[PDB]
């Protein structure tokens, strides 16, 4: 089963997630994310650092970006 969708403003940035196998967006720009076999998640800007959920991966991307626009993949 895929995780639930989410939508919130995190550190001033709109993060959205939805099942697709799952998509995340940061201010409307899609962010590559991936699920590991143990159920953890990573994003392309944190791709060696598992976190428990796609929202956690989106928040890790906002933390990584330090305010900068994401560019599309």
């Amino acid at each position: 089963a895929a995780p639930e969708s989410f939508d919130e403003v995190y550190k001033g940035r709109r993060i959205q997630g939805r099942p697709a196998g799952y998509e995340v967006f940061v201010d409307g720009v899609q962010l590559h994310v991936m699920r590991n076999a143990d159920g953890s998640w990573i994003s392309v800007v944190s791709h060696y650092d598992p976190v428990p959920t796609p929202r956690a991966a989106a928040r890790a991307a906002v933390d990584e970006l330090q305010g900068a626009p994401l560019l599309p993949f």
């Binding site: 991936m34 392309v44 800007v45 060696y48 990584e64 330090q66 560019l71």
Partner: protein
């Protein structure tokens, strides 16, 4: 071809390595290595085709990727070889690796920007082009996101694992390859990416020249594992969906197999193994 511990390079060898890397950047060749690595880490998945990461071919794939990069360096200066970073030994920000005559240091706290060394954005010689984070300067936060690099005792515990890899041949596996990669256990290779931070924590991690020195030491650890376990070898050995078996070719080259890459000494030796 001898791959040397970075800590041992002469000032001349550091100068020549840096100039060769800067020339691959200026000529446009460097950024295509960055692009190839990001394309594989976005496509390598635990339940589908997986080649460069989270799979038994993680190690031969990165061995061939580093060989391609070393050959490109040698096309600029034939005396240059890839050095390796033993992060178990050279484990602080004071390491000579991070000095201004070599890779430069950590980034400043506000925006992660590396401010010294030859790859600092202010030099004009190290544009970050292939990127996901839109910022165009090299960034690092050494020890920011995880507090310690692996220790020698931790590396030893992974080296002692007898099986090369095990079904299901992905990030959930037991065995040496996944413990070295780091998705299970005390975590060697992934933790080093996270410890450097900046681009090294992302799919475009070859944007930092330390990428190559990190993976040259990972590659050395494979060589040490083999010497510890001469009775053990690459697996799987045929018929495995979505996984590169021993005698199967690997993308993107298509013309080389794990079997062709197990013996590093056909291509280089280490200063000490």
């Amino acid at each position: 071809t001898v791959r040397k511990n970075q800590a041992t390079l002469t000032a001349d060898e550091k100068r020549r390595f840096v100039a060769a890397v800067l020339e691959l950047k200026r000529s446009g060749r460097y950024d295509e290595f960055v692009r190839t690595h990001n394309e594989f880490i976005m496509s390598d998945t635990d339940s589908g085709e997986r080649t460069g990461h989270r799979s038994p071919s993680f190690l031969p794939w990165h061995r061939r990727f580093l060989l391609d990069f070393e050959q490109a360096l040698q096309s600029v200066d034939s005396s240059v070889t890839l050095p390796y970073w033993d992060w178990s030994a050279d484990r602080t920000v004071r390491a000579s690796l991070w000095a201004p005559d070599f890779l430069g240091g950590t980034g400043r706290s506000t925006d992660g920007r590396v401010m010294d060394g030859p790859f600092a954005a202010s030099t004009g010689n190290w544009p970050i082009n292939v990127r996901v984070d839109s910022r165009t300067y090299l960034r690092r936060s050494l020890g920011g996101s995880v507090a310690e690099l692996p220790t020698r005792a931790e590396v030893e515990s992974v080296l002692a694992i007898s099986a090369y890899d095990l079904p299901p041949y992905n990030s959930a596996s037991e065995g040496f390859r996944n413990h070295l990669e780091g998705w299970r256990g005390v975590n060697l290779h992934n933790r080093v990416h996270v410890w450097v931070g900046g681009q090294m924590a992302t799919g475009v991690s070859p944007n930092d020249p330390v990428f190559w020195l990190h993976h040259a030491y990972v590659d050395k650890l494979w060589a040490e594992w083999q010497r510890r376990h001469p009775d053990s070898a690459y697996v799987p050995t045929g018929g495995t969906p979505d996984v590169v078996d021993l005698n199967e070719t690997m993308k993107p080259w298509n013309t080389v197999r794990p079997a062709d890459l197990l013996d590093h000494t056909a291509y280089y030796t280490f200063d000490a193994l």
